[PDB]
Amino acid sequence: GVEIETISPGDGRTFPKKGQTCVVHYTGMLQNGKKFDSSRDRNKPFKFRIGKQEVIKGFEEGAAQMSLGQRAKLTCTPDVAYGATGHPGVIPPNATLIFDVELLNLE
């Protein structure tokens, strides 16, 4: 369950493939909650690769459904990242996560 709301500018064709180290300007948000993690804060925009399950499933599936320049908006379901477990101190159990995802990638 990945719902994509793309802010219009981009190219619409440069999709992430397998093993491509790609760069995302993410900005996390909790439903009826504040921020918890942001690549804008560290200004190190999280050079991660596709296909190793490094990122969560709500963020991995939102990456391949975007293209270069595009600015989508994730609505991550709880049961893909932390719905039953929950992270201690950051993400509670059964949380619907929100991400300001822009795909300005490499490779």
Domains and their CATH numbers in the chain: 1-107 (3.10.50.40)
Within 13 Å, how many C-alpha atoms sit on residue 90's CB side? 10
Catalytic residue among 26, 48, 59, 100: 26
Catalytic residue among 15, 48, 59, 99: 99
Q: State the Cα–Cα distance between residues 29 and 38, nearest whole angstrom.
A: 9
Contact predicate 28/36, CB 8 Å: yes
Resolution for this model in angstroms, one decimal place? Answer: 4.5
Q: Which method, experimentally, gave rise to this model?
A: cryo-EM
Specify whether 26 is catalytic: yes
Sheet with 71-76: strands ordered across: 28-30, 97-102, 71-76
Specify whether 48 is catalytic: no
Catalytic residue among 15, 48, 59, 82: 82
Specify whether 7 is catalytic: no
